[PDB]
Design a protein around this ligand. Structure first.
Ligand SMILES: Nc1ncnc2c1ncn2[C@@H]1O[C@H](COP(=O)(O)OP(=O)(O)O)[C@@H](O)[C@H]1O
Ligand SMILES: Nc1ncnc2c1ncn2[C@@H]1O[C@H](COP(=O)(O)OP(=O)(O)O)[C@@H](O)[C@H]1O
Ligand SMILES: Nc1ncnc2c1ncn2[C@@H]1O[C@H](COP(=O)(O)OP(=O)(O)O)[C@@H](O)[C@H]1O
Ligand SMILES: Nc1ncnc2c1ncn2[C@@H]1O[C@H](COP(=O)(O)OP(=O)(O)O)[C@@H](O)[C@H]1O
Lengths: 566, 111, 559
């Protein structure tokens, strides 16, 4: 049967479920004697296919308590009055065989949003469910677990205390989680020696457990189809000397991956970034500032409360485009081992155009649920830029979205470790209400990269592709003076393209000459040709604005000669 | 003393003008001569016409002009105490930045 | 059974309910003989989990009256027609066992808003409830109590006179209320010497009674789990002494609090401020004006009646930003022991963008319920500035939210003690309609702090942090000259940050020699270093603006 081994991906959520469920079920008498109250309702979030039913079944099997399954559509498909009878019978039967777990599969099908009822028998079913829920006068030990896709798709009457008040969020698996799922689903089949499950796990960006299981099954069936056609003997029984002789190769996995339909691609992704400080050269002062602002409070709270200092909430990055504002946020999120959720400019523009700023509440709720977390708002100026920019439509510097961000930020509890980082390249057009103390007080200037920074960028970009040992990256960084973090990437990509073109041309020429590898690495010639097309993204007439702004900010601090009389 | 732009007994290190001496201006000495740019302000109905003097190619880093100081000084000199005048400051900053852009770093046209 | 002492934060509400219910129940003969109508319906507001079934149960038990409980969902789960029979039987049984109290748990479930309900069976149930409630004129000493969340979630026909006429609002507990709730819930438990419920009560901001009970249970369970795995005392039964051998620690409470999701966090905070006059120095004239305008009418009504002087409706504070306009309002609210409701500028902007100006009415209703109260509007110029500014885009300064504020302030009786205070740092673009003799007639200038006030500001900011005796705040206050409160607090924050960084660095370094409290206070060198980042937020031009505005206002009055 199912167990904890059959579940991959999520690990913290399974730990929380174990903590909440194992003690009251495995120790009935001990909990009865003790005067505390165990939870009597758990609500599992997450998109379909994440394995919520699997989690509930595995917990019930491992604990050993009786497991009774209530299916939403099955309950709602019966006749009026018969559905209520089935629900009551299920509850009383589960109570009789205590301890027990009652799993309501699709709760949003039984008790949807109130405005979406549009009926009477549906409301009667919801009321019957509420009566049965509030009727759990201990009844030895029965735990009711329900699964829903979204928190908003449940009748709010079920959220109150004595009901489904405890919530567990099951998200999209990460790369390690996807690798675990693939290993679980491939442990029974035979793979060829060149199959690297880590590679395919990293390739699948947006996938849930069902998608990965389907991918493995599709690859296995592809191998079976490519093999059995040779033997073409569909005998009475599948003989054992065929499956063993058949192995799935990397080619089949790539073929199945290409013809795959991800289920969750527009879902916001929350995970610890894999970038580090080595990917960005220099900027040591900014690194120290970020460590001071976001790493100290989460690591030494006692020293913060000892001096009675309230930690800051936000930091605003400004500077020319492409200099690595996003990379710094990802690196600082990774260094503290905290979750990172990114909100791009198009998201804010969609909220502004659609006049739906209630999604900001959803964003902040997700950040709160994924604490500790780093919330990164990219190009906050976009809305201000969409309203004419410097020459606006005659109105003030305020909009329905940034104001909602301010409202959510003010009401955000400082005890929880949620840190907000904003990025922009036009500090002049930013709403001054953002820079008010208590919301976003720190301003950090990100200048153009320096020599060591350029060398680090080149090394980081060229890490994946082979290069010739004769290439002198130091001289290339010397040649490049005013480029940004994107021009170097462009140069590297042009060199790679030239190498690829030369390889393909040589291959075609050799094959056409053959009627009766020349380039394994990228050499100096490719970089020499690539540098003939390099272009400075930011002109010398555009950095002067940032330099003058920073100079004005620095020059106003004219109190560096204060000394006590001693 | 000196009135404006007169030669001063102090050799200019970055004598791009070729005079070889620093020139007096606004109570200080500059290696080069400022560049004049017309500008008009229309705050509060009244219109004021002025000439912004922009300094560039100066050996001293602190002696180079800063737009955010020039615009603020001009606005406070012509419209002192008016509420919500920072919009005028931003407009002047943008106009000066657009007007002073050099396509070739050789178009020195001293007044 | 449940008793009166089990109730926690809500103390005034319990007093009101006692004074409303004890007399008819304890002395039925007195009220039956006398020709005074006892209350027949009581409605209890408040978000879920605040405790409302508890209060009714406690009142019924203390008064020794029959208590009959009716659940909304329970009555609505029955078949059509059977629900009416259940309601009639409940009312008849309660009438039989006089005196009696009927509690309807989820009133909004039985009788929601009229547009929300669509089926005819639901309307039939609501009409049956109305008929039963109107049939209480027989006076069998039966009192009906109901609970809900919002005043508007109930059918307005249920708030008619003769049915649920009375009204008691139970809100979010305050700091002392939360402390009392924690003490009540931790009576059976055993704590450790390092656990002080007062500190955690201060920290729990947006929690309700159910949230505090959950927090206590989670902390106790975490302690039990931390001890059980080590003791591995998994036997058939549980020993008596093992429970008394374990206690909850402060770390358990900290962990539980950090892993807690408060329910009532978006609700308006209506409490008495803890800010006193000592937190802001100087401005004696402003203190006198505030006491004269908000304290005299609430403590000497006879004087105002005798002289026939209408109390002032409110004032408007104007001045450069960060000079302590909110602190004065909080201090004057605290000095009068009156509730304080604050409405920031983003709230006004949300109401303007979403065109949901009707909520303004609701706000005043809340301020009407918690009288006496001080209603504070921050950044009244935000709406005007957002749609233009000095020039603007279209017509005058009128808008939606400001117009609703005017039409609600005009239609407010002076018998209720609600005082409205507005603050703005751009008095030029404020709507002249507000500055009218009867809405916001008073204009008060809040200038930059003076030498004697900066010392008080620094002391108030530093009272929470250790400071070395060598620090001479007088010299710092003399040197600042042209700073604001928002700059002095920034200086203090930077000094504390430097001290924390030095402590962290020293602690890390001292761990390097371990393979083979250096800074207890804040020295003067920390302040000397932090002063290098000191920036003056308000220029001289802004001072000129405000001084010219005040001079133009003052030059009109000369005699
Ligand atoms: N984290 C996981 N580890 C292993 N298998 C998973 C995981 N998530 C999903 N699956 C697979 O997906 C399949 C379907 O999941 P399902 O129980 O339908 O999820 P839900 O009920 O939430 O839609 C299961 O057979 C399971 O093997
Ligand atoms: N300072 C930098 N160090 C390393 N890589 C950089 C840097 N700046 C830009 N890049 C490159 O730019 C890409 C992403 O740019 P990004 O940081 O999003 O630009 P912006 O700073 O404008 O947000 C990355 O692939 C990265 O390799
Ligand atoms: N002020 C309080 N004092 C003591 N206990 C409280 C208080 N508020 C809430 N509780 C606890 O919360 C629990 C649930 O409250 P409940 O009566 O369900 O609130 P509501 O009726 O608003 O849903 C009760 O068991 C009660 O012990
Ligand atoms: N006059 C003052 N006295 C003490 N603290 C002040 C003063 N002015 C500002 N502050 C500090 O600034 C913060 C917010 O200032 P606030 O009073 O909201 O400014 P404003 O007067 O513009 O509303 C508070 O935390 C407070 O500690």
């Amino acid at each position: 049967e199912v167990g904890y081994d059959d579940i991959g991906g999520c690990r913290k959520q399974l730990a929380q479920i174990k903590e909440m469920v194992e003690l009251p079920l495995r120790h009935p008498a001990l909990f009865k004697a003790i005067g505390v109250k165990p939870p009597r309702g758990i609500l599992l979030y997450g998109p379909p296919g994440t394995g919520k039913t699997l989690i509930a079944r595995a917990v019930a099997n491992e604990t050993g308590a009786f497991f009774f399954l209530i299916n939403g559509p099955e309950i709602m498909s019966k006749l009026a009055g018969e559905s209520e009878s089935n629900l009551r019978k299920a509850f009383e039967e589960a109570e009789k065989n205590a301890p027990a777990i009652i799993f309501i599969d699709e709760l949003d099908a039984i008790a949807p949003k109130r405005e979406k009822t549009h009926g009477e028998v549906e409301r009667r079913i919801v009321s019957q469910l509420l009566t049965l829920m509030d009727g759990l006068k201990q009844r030895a030990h029965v735990i009711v677990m329900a699964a829903t896709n979204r928190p908003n798709s449940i009748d709010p009457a079920l959220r109150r205390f004595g009901r489904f008040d405890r919530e567990v969020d099951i998200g999209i698996p990460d790369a390690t989680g996807r690798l675990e799922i693939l290993q679980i689903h491939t442990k029974n089949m035979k793979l060829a020696d060149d199959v690297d499950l880590e590679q395919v796990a990293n390739e699948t960006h947006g996938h849930v457990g069902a998608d990965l299981a389907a991918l493995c099954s599709e690859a296995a069936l592809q191998a079976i189809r490519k093999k059995m056609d040779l033997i073409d003997l569909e005998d009475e029984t599948i003989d054992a000397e065929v499956m063993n002789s058949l192995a799935v190769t990397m080619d089949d996995f790539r073929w199945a991956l290409s013809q795959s339909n991800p289920s969750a691609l527009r879902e916001t992704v929350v995970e610890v970034p894999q970038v580090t400080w080595e990917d960005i050269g220099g900027l040591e002062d900014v690194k120290r500032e970020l460590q001071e602002l976001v790493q100290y409070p989460v690591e030494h709270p006692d020293k913060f409360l000892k001096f009675g200092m309230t930690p800051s909430k936000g930091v605003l990055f400004y500077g020319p485009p492409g200099c690595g504002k996003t990379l710094l946020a990802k690196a600082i999120a990774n260094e503290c081992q905290a979750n990172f959720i990114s909100i791009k400019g198009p998201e804010l523009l969609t909220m502004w155009f659609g006049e739906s700023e209630a999604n900001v509440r959803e964003i902040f709720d997700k950040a709160r649920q994924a604490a500790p977390c780093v919330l990164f708002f990219d190009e906050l100026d976009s809305i201000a830029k969409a309203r004419g920019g410097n020459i606006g439509d005659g109105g003030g510097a305020a909009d329905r979205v940034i104001n909602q961000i301010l409202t959510e930020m003010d009401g955000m509890s400082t005890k929880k470790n949620v840190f907000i980082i904003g990025a922009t390249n036009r500090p002049d057009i930013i709403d001054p209400a953002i820079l008010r103390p208590g919301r976003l007080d720190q301003l950090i200037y990100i200048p153009l990269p320096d020599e060591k920074s350029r060398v680090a960028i080149l090394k980081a970009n060229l890490r994946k592709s082979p290069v010739a040992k004769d290439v002198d990256l130091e001289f290339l960084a010397k040649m490049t003076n005013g480029f940004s973090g994107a021009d170097l990437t462009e140069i590297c990509q042009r060199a790679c393209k030239l190498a690829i073109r030369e390889s393909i041309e040589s291959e075609i020429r050799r094959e056409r000459e053959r009627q009766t590898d020349p380039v394994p690495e990228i050499r100096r010639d490719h970089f020499e040709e690539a540098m003939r097309f390099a272009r400075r993204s930011v002109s010398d007439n555009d950095i002067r604005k940032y330099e003058m702004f920073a100079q004005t900010l620095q020059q106003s601090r004219g109190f560096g000669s204060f000394r006590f009389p001693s | 003393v000196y009135l404006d732009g007169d030669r001063t007994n102090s050799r200019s290190t970055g004598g791009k003008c070729g005079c070889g001496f620093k020139h007096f201006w606004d109570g200080k000495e500059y290696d080069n001569l400022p560049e004049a740019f017309p500008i008009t302000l229309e705050w509060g109905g009244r219109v004021v016409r002025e000439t912004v003097y922009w300094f560039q190619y100066e050996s001293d880093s602190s002696l180079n002009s800063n737009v955010y100081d020039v615009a603020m000084k001009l606005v406070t000199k012509h419209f002192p105490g008016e509420f919500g005048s920072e919009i005028l400051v931003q407009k002047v900053v943008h106009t000066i930045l657009h007007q002073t852009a050099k396509k070739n770093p050789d178009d020195y046209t001293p007044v």
